[PDB]
Design a protein around this ligand. Structure first.
Ligand SMILES: [Ca+2]
Lengths: 56, 221
C-alpha cells in the first residue's frame, strides 16, 4: 500500500510543495518534492490525496 | 545553497526566481525575453521574478513577468534526468539590477572555478530557506570522479562541481539556477544526493552542449 509509504523528496533540487497521505495522522499533509522521481504517495492537491488514500 | 555566502543585492543580475505562489526554482536570464532553467522545474502558471534579492519583500527593483511559453528539451528523460534543460519565454520583455548572462563559446574544464547562486535550503541536515540570494564558488570536477561518485548515472550532458569534503553544495530550491564560469553560463543546478554530503558532489546540466538548440529555439519561438 503506497498510501502507507513515507513522502519521497527525490534527488532533484526543486522546492515543489506536494501532498502525501500520513496514515499516522489520518490526513494528507504537505512535504517538499524535489521535482523528479516521484513515488505514488505524492499528490498535487489535498482532494486528490483524500480521494486516492483517504482512510488507509 | 549550503555553506555559501550572501551575494549582495543584485550582484547576480541574471538570476531569476520561478514563482508559482512561492519560490520553487531558479533560472537565468539569457536575453530580455528568455530564461533558461531545468526541465524538472516545469510547472503551469509560472511567474518569473527578476531583480530580486529578498524574495519575501518587495523592494522596488523587481519585475514580475508571467511565462508565455515553457519549452522543455524534446529529449528530457524524467527517469535518467538526461537533457534536464528548459526555456521559458517571458510574456513581455524585461527592462534590462536585471541583466542577461552569456552562453558559453566552449565547454569548461575540470578545475574551473564557478559561481553557483540560489534561494534554496541552507542547512544540510535541517531546513532554512533564506530571504536573500546565496552564492557559492565551487570548482568543476573531472568526468572520472563524477562518474565514480554516481556509478552509471552520469551522461555526457552532466558535470559535477563542488567539494568531496562536503558542506558546500546546492540544495532544495536551487534547481534551475546558474553555474557561471568566466562570465559564461556553463551549468544549470540539477540533482545530487541530499545536500552537501561528503563524496557526493552536485550534478549540473552541461550547457555548452545545448548552445545550438538554445539559439535556434529562441529564434523560432
Ligand atoms: Ca523582493
Amino acid at each position: 500500500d503506497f498510501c502507507l509509504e513515507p513522502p519521497y523528496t527525490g534527488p532533484c533540487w526543486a522546492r515543489i510543495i506536494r501532498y502525501f497521505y500520513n496514515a499516522k495522522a489520518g490526513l494528507c499533509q504537505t512535504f517538499v518534492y524535489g521535482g523528479c522521481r516521484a513515488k505514488r504517495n505524492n499528490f498535487k492537491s489535498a482532494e486528490d490525496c483524500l480521494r486516492t488514500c483517504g482512510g488507509a | 545553497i549550503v555553506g555559501g555566502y550572501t551575494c549582495g543585492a543584485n550582484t547576480v543580475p541574471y538570476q531569476v526566481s520561478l514563482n508559482s505562489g512561492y519560490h520553487f526554482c531558479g533560472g537565468s536570464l539569457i536575453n530580455s525575453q528568455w530564461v533558461v532553467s531545468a526541465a524538472h522545474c516545469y510547472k503551469s502558471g509560472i511567474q518569473v521574478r527578476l531583480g530580486e534579492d529578498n524574495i519575501n519583500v518587495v523592494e522596488g527593483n523587481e519585475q514580475f513577468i508571467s511565462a508565455s511559453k515553457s519549452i522543455v528539451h524534446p529529449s528530457y528523460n524524467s527517469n535518467t534526468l538526461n537533457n534536464d534543460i528548459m526555456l521559458i519565454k517571458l510574456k513581455s520583455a524585461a527592462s534590462l539590477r536585471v541583466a542577461s548572462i552569456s552562453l558559453p563559446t566552449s565547454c569548461a574544464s575540470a578545475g574551473t572555478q564557478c559561481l553557483i547562486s540560489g534561494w534554496g535550503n541552507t542547512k544540510s541536515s535541517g531546513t532554512s530557506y533564506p530571504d536573500v540570494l546565496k552564492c557559492l564558488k565551487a570548482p568543476i570536477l573531472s568526468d572520472s570522479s563524477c562518474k565514480s561518485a554516481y556509478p552509471g548515472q552520469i551522461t555526457s550532458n552532466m558535470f559535477c562541481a563542488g567539494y568531496l569534503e562536503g558542506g558546500k553544495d546546492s540544495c532544495q530550491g536551487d534547481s534551475g539556477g546558474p553555474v557561471v564560469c568566466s562570465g559564461k553560463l556553463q551549468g544549470i543546478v540539477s540533482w545530487g544526493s541530499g545536500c552537501a554530503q561528503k563524496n557526493k558532489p552536485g550534478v549540473y546540466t552541461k550547457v555548452c552542449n545545448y548552445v545550438s538548440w538554445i539559439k535556434q529555439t529562441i529564434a523560432s519561438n
